[PDB]
Write a protein that binds this ligand. Structure first.
Ligand SMILES: Cc1cc2nc3c(=O)[nH]c(=O)nc-3n(C[C@H](O)[C@H](O)[C@H](O)COP(=O)(O)O)c2cc1C
Ligand SMILES: Cc1cc2nc3c(=O)[nH]c(=O)nc-3n(C[C@H](O)[C@H](O)[C@H](O)COP(=O)(O)O)c2cc1C
Ligand SMILES: [Zn+2]
Ligand SMILES: [Zn+2]
Ligand SMILES: [Zn+2]
Ligand SMILES: [Zn+2]
Ligand SMILES: [Zn+2]
Ligand SMILES: [Zn+2]
Lengths: 183, 183
C-alpha cells in the first residue's frame, strides 16, 4: 500500500554538485546545488537552479561561466559546508583547505581535490529560475578511469543527496547495462 | 592528475525516472528519463527534458499531466525496456506485466509496483526543451517509510543512471547528515 506524503521536493537520486565561480575580484567560490541535472545532449548541457540571494548567482551573471565539481565521500563535510555558508565575505577554499584550480576552457575555478570536474559556459538564463551551462570539458582523475577511458563511478565515489530527510549517501553496486538489460 | 574526456553528457548521479502518461485514447505509457531533476521549491517542481519524437511528449502536451515512478532494483530491466521501446503502438504495461494506477490528483498513471510515485501537473513548457511539472503528491510504499514518515532511501532502493558508460547502479550506504556535517 502507498502513503501520500503531500507536495514535497522529494525524489531520488538528487546530485550534490559544487558550483564553482570567480567573483568580480577573482575570489574563488563554491556552493552546493542539488536542484540540477543534465538537460540536453546538443550541446551537452547542465541546468542548475540557483537562487538570487546566493553570491554564486551574481558571479555567474557577471562572468558567464561556472564549474561543477563532484565530491567523493571523503569530501562530504566540505560539500555540506559550501551549502551552509556564503562566499560573499568568506573564501571557502581557504576555510576548507581546498584548491581552486582555474578552468582550462572557462572563466571559473574547480575543486582540485575532487575526482571529477566539469567546465561550463553559460548559454541560457531562464526565468522558475535556472542557469543552463554548456559542458565544455569533463575532467576525471586518471585513477578513476576504466581502460576504455570512461569513469568508474565507484572510484569517483560521488555523493547522493536525499532531500527532505536531508542526508547524504554513497553509490552502491552495479546492477545492469543500460540500453541492454531491457532487451 | 586529471584527464580531459571532452564535451560529454557526463555527471553523477543521474536519475532513472519513469514518466507516466495517458494518450488520447487513455492508453497508459511510461518512458525512461535521466535528463531531469528537481528545479524549484516553490511550487515544488521537477524538470524533465523530453524529446519531441517521444510518444510521451505528445501525451504531456495534450493532457498537461504526468507522473514519475521511481524503480527499485528489481525493476531495472523493466525501466530499461521503457527507455528502449516506444508506446506509440505498444502498451508497455501489458508487455512488462506492470500496473498502470490512475493518479489521484493528476490525469496520468503511475507504476503500481514501484516503491515511489510522484504526481505532476504541467506548469511550464520551456523551449533546449523541458517540461516543468508541479509536484501535487509524492506516494511511497508504507514498508519504505521511517517512523517520522519520510522515506528510507535504501528501502526505496532507487536506480541511478551512469551516462555514456550506460550503466545502472544502486544507492549505497549512508554517509552523513546534510545541513549538519559541514558545521
Ligand atoms: C544539499 C544541498 C543542496 C543545495 N541545493 C541548492 C540548489 O540547488 N540551489 C540553491 O540556490 N541553493 C542550494 N543550496 C544552498 C546553497 O548551497 C547555499 O545557499 C550556499 O551557502 C550558497 O553559497 P554562496 O552564497 O557562496 O553562493 C543547497 C545546499 C545544500 C547543503
Ligand atoms: C537510461 C535512459 C535515459 C533516458 N533519458 C531520456 C530523457 O531524459 N529524455 C528523453 O527524451 N529520452 C530519454 N530516454 C529515451 C526514451 O526513454 C525512449 O526514447 C523511449 O522509448 C520513449 O518512449 P515513448 O515513445 O513511449 O514516449 C532515455 C532512455 C534510457 C534507457
Ligand atoms: Zn538544455
Ligand atoms: Zn535537448
Ligand atoms: Zn586496466
Ligand atoms: Zn522550476
Ligand atoms: Zn525556484
Ligand atoms: Zn519503527
Amino acid at each position: 500500500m502507498k502513503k501520500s506524503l503531500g507536495a514535497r521536493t522529494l525524489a531520488y537520486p538528487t546530485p550534490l554538485f559544487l558550483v564553482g565561480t570567480y567573483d568580480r575580484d577573482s575570489r574563488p567560490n563554491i556552493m552546493a546545488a542539488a536542484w540540477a541535472g543534465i538537460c540536453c545532449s546538443q550541446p551537452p548541457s547542465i541546468a542548475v537552479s540557483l537562487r538570487k540571494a546566493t553570491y554564486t548567482y551574481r558571479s555567474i551573471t557577471e562572468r558567464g561561466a561556472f564549474t561543477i565539481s563532484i565530491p567523493s565521500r571523503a569530501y562530504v563535510r566540505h560539500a555540506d559546508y559550501a551549502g551552509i555558508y556564503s562566499g560573499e565575505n568568506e573564501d571557502k577554499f581557504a576555510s576548507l583547505g581546498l584548491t581552486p584550480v582555474p578552468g582550462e576552457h572557462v572563466d571559473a575555478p574547480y575543486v582540485g581535490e575532487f575526482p571529477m570536474a566539469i567546465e561550463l559556459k553559460l548559454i541560457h538564463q531562464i526565468e522558475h529560475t535556472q542557469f543552463i551551462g554548456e559542458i565544455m570539458d569533463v575532467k576525471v582523475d586518471e585513477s578513476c578511469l576504466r581502460d576504455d577511458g570512461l569513469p568508474d563511478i565507484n572510484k569517483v565515489d560521488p555523493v547522493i543527496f536525499a532531500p527532505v530527510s536531508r542526508e547524504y549517501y554513497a553509490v552502491g553496486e552495479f546492477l545492469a547495462k543500460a540500453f541492454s538489460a531491457g532487451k
